[PDB]
Amino acid sequence: SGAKFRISLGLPVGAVINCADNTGAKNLYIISVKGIKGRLNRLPAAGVGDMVMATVKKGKPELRKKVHPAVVIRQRKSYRRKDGVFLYFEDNAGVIVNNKGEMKGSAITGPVAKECADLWPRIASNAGSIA
Amino acid sequence: EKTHINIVVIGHVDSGKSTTTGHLIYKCGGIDKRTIEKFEKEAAEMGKGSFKYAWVLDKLKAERERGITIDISLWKFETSKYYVTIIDAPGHRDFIKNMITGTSQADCAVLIVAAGVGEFEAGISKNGQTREHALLAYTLGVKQLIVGVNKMDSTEPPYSQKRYEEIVKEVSTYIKKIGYNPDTVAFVPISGWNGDNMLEPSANMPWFKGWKVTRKDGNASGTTLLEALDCILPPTRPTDKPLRLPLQDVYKIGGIGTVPVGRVETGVLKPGMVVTFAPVNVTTEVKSVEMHHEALSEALPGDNVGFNVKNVSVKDVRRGNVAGDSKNDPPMEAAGFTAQVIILNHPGQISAGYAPVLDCHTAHIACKFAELKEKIDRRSGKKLEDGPKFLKSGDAAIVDMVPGKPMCVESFSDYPPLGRFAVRDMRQTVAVGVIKAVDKK
Amino acid sequence: FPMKQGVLTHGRVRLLLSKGHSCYRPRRTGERKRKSVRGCIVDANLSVLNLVIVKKGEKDIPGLTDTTVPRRLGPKRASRIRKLFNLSKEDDVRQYVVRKPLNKEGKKPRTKAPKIQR
RNA sequence: UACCUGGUUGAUCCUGCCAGUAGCAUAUGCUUGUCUCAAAGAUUAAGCCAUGCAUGUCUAAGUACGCACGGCCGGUACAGUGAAACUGCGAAUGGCUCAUUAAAUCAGUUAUGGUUCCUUUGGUCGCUCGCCACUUGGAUAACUGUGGUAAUUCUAGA
RNA sequence: GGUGACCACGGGUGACGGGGAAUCAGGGUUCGAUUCCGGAGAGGGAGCCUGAGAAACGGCUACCACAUCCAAGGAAGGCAGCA
RNA sequence: AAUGAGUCCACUUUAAAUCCUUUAACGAGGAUCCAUUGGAGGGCAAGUCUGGUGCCAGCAGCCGCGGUAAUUCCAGCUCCAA
RNA sequence: CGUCGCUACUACCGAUUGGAUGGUUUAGUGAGGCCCUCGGAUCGGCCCCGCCGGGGUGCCCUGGCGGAGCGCUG
RNA sequence: GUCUCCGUAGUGUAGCGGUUAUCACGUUCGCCUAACACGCGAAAGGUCCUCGGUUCGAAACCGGGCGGAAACACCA
Ligand SMILES: [Mg+2]
Ligand SMILES: [Mg+2]
Ligand SMILES: [Mg+2]
Ligand SMILES: [Mg+2]
Ligand SMILES: [Mg+2]
Ligand SMILES: [Mg+2]
Ligand SMILES: [Mg+2]
Ligand SMILES: [Mg+2]
Ligand SMILES: [Mg+2]
């Protein structure tokens, strides 16, 4: 199998990231990160490939005042890929999924990180390109 | 050239039906190497790696997600002797009606039986399906079948002679009660996932000499499942009887419209002739006839044909209908019809009035007993008692029935495959019957 | 994807090719179509590599520099035979044309000559 | 065919509308023996389309050394029938639809002495003083051969 | 400077224009997507090669929206033509 | 006595058919080879008929009908319009 | 005749710096084509002329290898 | 096809593995009135969508099938 390695997170609670799928939502506002035990005063932060709980601030009115599971696919914070490559993207992006991992939308705009693609096959299926 | 038959693979859950079917397809020039490589890639991406051969027929998203066969699927592969396309079983009591639909529309049957420790015993039980599939295959009109022994490398020790002999004996002792002759029914030990004893003689299994069958038409004796498929006797195709098509599924293909796919039971279907559907009573003209991505000018009985009818929507004609020629005598709605049900397993008493679900050919419509006419002996239609108050397991009876939902049936004398039906209640098999008389509207 | 002379890169580019550049024949007059073409620099990522030998080596490579294949049909213009056979001016020009002898099994023997032009 | 009738009131004259009446033009319901014409996915979606066809073309009179046939009349450039291909022409007509469009399109009238025009037809083509002309040069098709890609009416080298 | 209560300008149209159609004392009132003429368009825009004639789309290029195949490296689309 | 609507030979038509017109031979006495659609208070032609229902069901473009003797509903008959 | 009480139906106002779908545009970015100014991956001619050659008689009519004139040019 | 929820007098619909009940009506219904109306009196009315399993017995504990009510997929 193989588990995901540690990467630089750079997206704490409260970050507003783009919504890269065609669900009609424009951005995702991160409220928490899955799998975070915690630490006093430490903000839960997420990297690419992490499940987060997010609410959309602008977009279709039927998605706004709800909490959606989301997965980060791109991030601006540079992270190491265990082979000396420090990679970062042009923007922070995520897609809206369910707790089983399948996306609510059907297409993804822009590249998707290899860590996110390898750990979510359903997101990797709809990714136009993988970085 | 080539003659057309049809085969179901029947067996227990998790016994390797879809995997064996798909890998047998792959051996017989079914699909190229890179597409199944992509299928294995997707299976490894999710995790169900061993289900890669199952993905050839289990194409739906739900089936691929759960690793559970839900709906019937079709695939074609040409063999050494003649053409054949294969039916994949769901293998579940949840989709027992899907299984009834699949095995009602068939010529031959493959009884895949697991050989590993534990799975075989779970298959042959009160909660198992190995009894159920064979019993309803005999009920719906499948005469000649084969019993296959799968997952031989799974059992401990692998490739054992004693295990296979025990499996053959245990299957025989009950299939003789079902009705099939084990002398005519071939027994083949196979391994779908490994690809063992499918196309070429085994090298990890030297103890298996070869199965033998003793039929009146012909004697056959081979080493693999492919030659065993080749030696299946051709069915008697009733071409002169009027055209009848129990409908499998409906599809709305872009640019050709709604093309009902069903089996020619009797008669011959050709492009350019008007048809009538029995329950909905809608008349329409057939544009063209095709099968398995290939066109036909004529459709012989025992063939899976897709034909394009004109100016009917997908909602108007749904799964479970009967199609027929309008020029000849067409199938009309059955307001009531008298059938000869034999009670197999039912703990409470059978009175006139309760509602089991009844399965004529493809469809599934629950019916209500109006009154029980005569108590009849177990065979030959021998009259025993007049107007019984109640019935009980282990007895036959002639009964008149009133379906609650619209449904069409035909007599066993005119069209033998239409006459076959079963009865289901209490999530089990409660009666087996055939229809002799029918009233129209 | 074939290579085009003058691309001056390694890899694939897209070029709006009109009539008579390379790697393109127009379906109708005036038609230009954008097509993918490989650059002129050759590297590891090729399938084939057309080469033309400029000068002969010291020995004969088998199957290529032996059993020379003749050009099928000779010149058709009168000057193009006069320069080939060193004619000065109108010396039996009709007869110095090349005659093509063709033989088949059912064919009755016959020689073939071209309609000499100009 | 320049036409009215019922309804406010206990009853009467009015105003006045409602309703009735007749035609055509869309749909729909019922019914339907013959025959002659004949509209027909405009109204909602100028929404989306599988498949198949809808634009190609040679005379004596541009270029045939394809054997793909064939007269040879037999010592000859080319008999002739002609695939393919080059060349020339057509593909800007026809057909469909009515979304846009309110002095815009369009209708009648008038001008281009303010412009262009394939083809047809008719003029003009010795009007010019100025070492191949008994005919000049090169390339490329078709064709042989070596291939590449999973693919295309994709093409490279020789 | 030019145009406006002789209705400019702006908006709407369930507006392509006309020859015409229905109704019919006379006068009129409605309808003309529809075979003839003229115009526009070819999924929405835009830019072009060829050719005498095209801003052509059963020609090309680019973007957008759909959407076909794929061995995922690419390739190919336009029925408001006849069905 | 006369005819078709239909079966149907041939001709004709037509690129080839089809249809029409010809023309053989069958083809009518419930000539069962069966005309329907709407109405019968008024407007508006046609029943103060009969049986049910009983302000219910329903009819009725409008006036209006129906609460146990309905010229208006539901049916039969008989009439009216095309 | 009106208020009040109940039940329906239809619109009106109304915080929500409401919401959705079209249309027209400022500004920024901006594919692609066309034009202009460059550019020169290649393909040809002349000067060929290291030479054998050469004929009107070392003075070539040129029938080919070959360097390359390392220029002039399209 | 795959999942999520709802489905009990005619409706309003409480409910408890030992009881599907009541309420507002709706109706019927003695009760008046020519008829209303207006009040007066009583009732009936439930397979818990439906069929099973579990259980000493279940509407309900569990599971199916049916219909609705939301999605999600569904291309010979
Ligand atoms: Mg703190
Ligand atoms: Mg010439
Ligand atoms: Mg021209
Ligand atoms: Mg318009
Ligand atoms: Mg018009
Ligand atoms: Mg026009
Ligand atoms: Mg145009
Ligand atoms: Mg255009
Ligand atoms: Mg009457």
Short mmCIF file of C-alpha atoms (C1' of nucleotides) in Angstrom, two decimals, chain A residues 2-5 7 47-50 71-75 79-83 85 87-89 110-121 123-125 127-131, chain B residues 45, chain E residues 72-73:
data_model
loop_
_atom_site.label_atom_id
_atom_site.label_comp_id
_atom_site.label_asym_id
_atom_site.label_seq_id
_atom_site.Cartn_x
_atom_site.Cartn_y
_atom_site.Cartn_z
CA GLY A 2 2.02 2.92 1.33
CA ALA A 3 0.92 5.88 3.45
CA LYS A 4 1.28 9.57 2.71
CA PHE A 5 4.40 11.25 4.06
CA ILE A 7 4.25 17.72 4.06
CA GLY A 47 -1.90 20.23 3.20
CA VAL A 48 -2.74 18.73 -0.16
CA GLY A 49 -4.59 15.43 0.11
CA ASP A 50 -6.14 16.24 3.49
CA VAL A 71 -10.06 17.74 -0.01
CA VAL A 72 -7.18 20.12 -0.74
CA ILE A 73 -5.73 19.52 -4.20
CA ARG A 74 -3.37 22.51 -4.58
CA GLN A 75 -1.49 24.74 -2.17
CA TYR A 79 6.54 21.17 0.37
CA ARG A 80 9.18 18.48 -0.04
CA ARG A 81 8.47 15.33 -2.08
CA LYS A 82 11.03 13.01 -0.43
CA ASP A 83 13.29 13.43 -3.49
CA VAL A 85 11.83 18.64 -5.05
CA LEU A 87 6.86 22.02 -5.19
CA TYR A 88 4.21 24.70 -4.80
CA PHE A 89 1.19 25.72 -6.85
CA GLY A 110 -6.16 22.90 -13.05
CA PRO A 111 -3.59 20.36 -11.88
CA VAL A 112 -3.90 18.09 -8.86
CA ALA A 113 -1.04 17.28 -6.50
CA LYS A 114 0.41 13.77 -6.69
CA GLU A 115 -0.14 13.21 -2.95
CA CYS A 116 -3.83 14.05 -3.34
CA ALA A 117 -4.20 11.98 -6.51
CA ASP A 118 -2.50 8.89 -5.06
CA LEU A 119 -4.60 8.95 -1.89
CA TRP A 120 -7.99 9.79 -3.48
CA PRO A 121 -8.58 7.67 -6.60
CA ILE A 123 -10.36 12.78 -7.40
CA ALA A 124 -7.48 11.42 -9.49
CA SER A 125 -9.97 10.08 -12.03
CA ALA A 127 -8.03 15.35 -12.63
CA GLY A 128 -7.05 16.88 -15.96
CA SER A 129 -3.36 16.80 -15.06
CA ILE A 130 -1.37 15.59 -12.06
CA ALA A 131 1.57 17.57 -10.68
CA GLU B 45 -6.16 2.28 -7.45
"C1'" A E 72 -3.68 9.06 -22.01
"C1'" G E 73 1.61 10.85 -26.00
#
